[PDB]
Design a protein around this ligand. Sequence first.
Ligand SMILES: Nc1ncnc2c1ncn2[C@@H]1O[C@H](COP(=O)(O)OP(=O)(O)O)[C@@H](O)[C@H]1O
Lengths: 418, 418, 82
Amino acid sequence: MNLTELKNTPVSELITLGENMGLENLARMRKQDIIFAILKQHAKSGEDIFGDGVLEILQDGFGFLRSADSSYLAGPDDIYVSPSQIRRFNLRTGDTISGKIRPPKEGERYFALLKVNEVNFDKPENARNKILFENLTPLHANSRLRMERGNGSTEDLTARVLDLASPIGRGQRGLIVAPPKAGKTMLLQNIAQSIAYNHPDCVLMVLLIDERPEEVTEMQRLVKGEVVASTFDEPASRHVQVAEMVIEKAKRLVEHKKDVIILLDSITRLARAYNTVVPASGKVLTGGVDANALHRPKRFFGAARNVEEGGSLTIIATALIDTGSKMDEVIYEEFKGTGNMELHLSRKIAEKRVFPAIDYNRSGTRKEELLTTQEELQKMWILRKIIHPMGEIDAMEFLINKLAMTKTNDDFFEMMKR
Amino acid sequence: MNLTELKNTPVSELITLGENMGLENLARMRKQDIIFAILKQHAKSGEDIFGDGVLEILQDGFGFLRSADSSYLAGPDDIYVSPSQIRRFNLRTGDTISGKIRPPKEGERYFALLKVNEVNFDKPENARNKILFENLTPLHANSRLRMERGNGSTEDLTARVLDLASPIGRGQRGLIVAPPKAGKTMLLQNIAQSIAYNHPDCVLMVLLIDERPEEVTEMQRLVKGEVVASTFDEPASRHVQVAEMVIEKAKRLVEHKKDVIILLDSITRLARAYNTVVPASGKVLTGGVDANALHRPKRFFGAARNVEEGGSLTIIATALIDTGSKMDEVIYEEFKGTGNMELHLSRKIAEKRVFPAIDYNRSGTRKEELLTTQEELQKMWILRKIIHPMGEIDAMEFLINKLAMTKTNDDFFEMMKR
Amino acid sequence: DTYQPINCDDYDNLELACQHHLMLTLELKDGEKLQAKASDLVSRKNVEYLVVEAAGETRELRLDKITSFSHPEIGTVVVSES
Ligand SMILES: Nc1ncnc2c1ncn2[C@@H]1O[C@H](COP(=O)(O)OP(=O)(O)O)[C@@H](O)[C@H]1O
């Protein structure tokens, strides 16, 4: 059967499927163990079994096809690819390989790839001729991602405020600066819903790092896309692995002229994870942050660009401030000028239970003339003039009331203009 | 074929060349690897191969000819230079070398320079005996850089305002103090194109340290000259490596009676890069900086001088203020007035969407009488008096409107009297 | 006419044979045998080719045309076109 359909069935259904196939004692083992046991039992019949995953080449030269359902966690059900296969089709980490697999032989441990059907949702012949990501020329964002759904619901207010504060375009390198208890999690969910509704073509990937287990399940139910997370139980090496898999998978899709959007939560937790993993170089900054530990996260954050040839990579990461940890403060100081889009959340606005808690004055974008039209830009300039003198708490209250009375932003503009 | 012509070829065209030469799997690999593979294939025929680059001397006496196309990044395409070649001539870091190269032999991974043809765009023997840069006699600035085009367009007035605020000549250090979001990048682009247009003879070099990838490509396509940049993805050691290559190359051109101009953006990030990479000697100062570490950035900035024998070295650095950090102020406090020419930008004036954001009161150049004729000095002196009373914000509005209908500076001075 | 790549397991055995430079007993569906040595596996115009020599011939033939190969070391593995 299909391997990816097994990983989507609930565990209760897997046991019933396994039990009527003759397997026993499947209830007390992990889901990955159950799937591996079922596949071996079905391999007895000699039927063809399919599978797919994302390639992760190890140091020794061989790789595995991890699955996004398990958040690219190493397990018994991973598919082994010999180094010759990586040579036969020039494959790099992050390639999405789908095809037939075979049961392990004597002395083997994992299922092995048998016949490659598609690479990156394309024929292997075409997928080998795609130019590498590093050879593509970065550009400023010029195609805008509009968050406004326009249905007039109260959940659309957060999206509409986002367009007024900081427009988001394809290939943007965003950064959301948020203190604790400022509604950061609900802000990302609105963005994910707006992206999945207005722009179904763009590939949406949500990356949660060092997150509570109950927050992961909530995100998976809501987000219409791919959600990969690593909870705080897992070691720091696990956090690095998931981030590497996501960014490499995103790069491979961009090389096929596709729009990829990555929502990261958070760049602070990711940077802390790298600080633990990398060996100490002897130069340690304030707060215990290694000097060269931040090189790896900046590679992740610096990959967001608008490719001239085609496609783009959009990264919208969140940075944590006012957490009481000096390690977070120094990490944030190294990402201040990196992004071309900045959105600030304020705890003071959140303390009054008025949402979203966006600090309008301190949030903006670079080269916003390209994203918006001439008339649209002037209206935002007119509005920003009104919001500039008033305080941050009054800025949102004034802006929320005006937006509530209307349905779309253009209606808000003409009402404000008159 | 010629390496420099091969290196400027688009990657898509490079692949087609490799296919016609029998190479395969050239896609999905870096541009440097493609160049290295093609050269080896062509050298297999046995034809002569021409290559050129900027010499870099390692600590072990190794010499490599880096390329300006890749911003002097170490790679497979680099040409290896034996220490015997360095001893034969007066070869040091930054000496441009053009000559014929050979494919590597067994035990060799880099192409080797075989017959050096041109050094510093002249005969190899002439460069074997030249006066060192430090031995050259320093002198103040005598010549003046004309930053006027006369077209009277909307972009020409920005050059005029900075020209009126503080004249800049050849051979004196210059500093630009700019806050975040103050049209700093647009200011550098306007200066860079004006210099190339007015002074095609001088060698223009633009250096960008810790810059966003999308900004580098925009700068390269706009600035007519040489643009060398290192993004924030690269480690700290890369930032200092690029800086050393640029200054050493600038010195050698000066030794050959050439007036070169270096535009730096920004010295604060370059100084921060040195602090990270320079090993700690046990002395810790306020703001997490080291006095011995700071000795190198000032040497880079302090190398600008006018040579009596011939040529000059002009450096116009950029300093960042009120960025919210702590060590940034310490860097600025070390360069309060170390530069002969100083220009200030203000966030307040740029806030009203009126450009340029030049603060006339704070700007000022030392020994300005050596630059322009005495008759024009009174014209600037009376201009300062008529502009001193009103504030810096209103000063810019007065300058722009009065210069709106004026073509050149000479017309403005005559119209100012009447 | 159109080339069809062989299964991954078959390719690995052939590369293993080429790496060890051991004798190869090439077999076809017609019933002809070529007990020769294969040097290396190469590709050309998106079609991989196997160069196998008996006495210096170094003939180059398509992989999909090879039907069976046997040796005392590796298993007698037949290829599958589907
Ligand atoms: N857009 C919003 N609309 C209404 N309430 C919100 C919104 N965003 C956040 N909140 C409220 O803020 C509280 C905490 O937000 P949370 O998602 O925990 O932020 P964080 O993840 O940064 O701690 C939630 O209980 C929620 O009710």
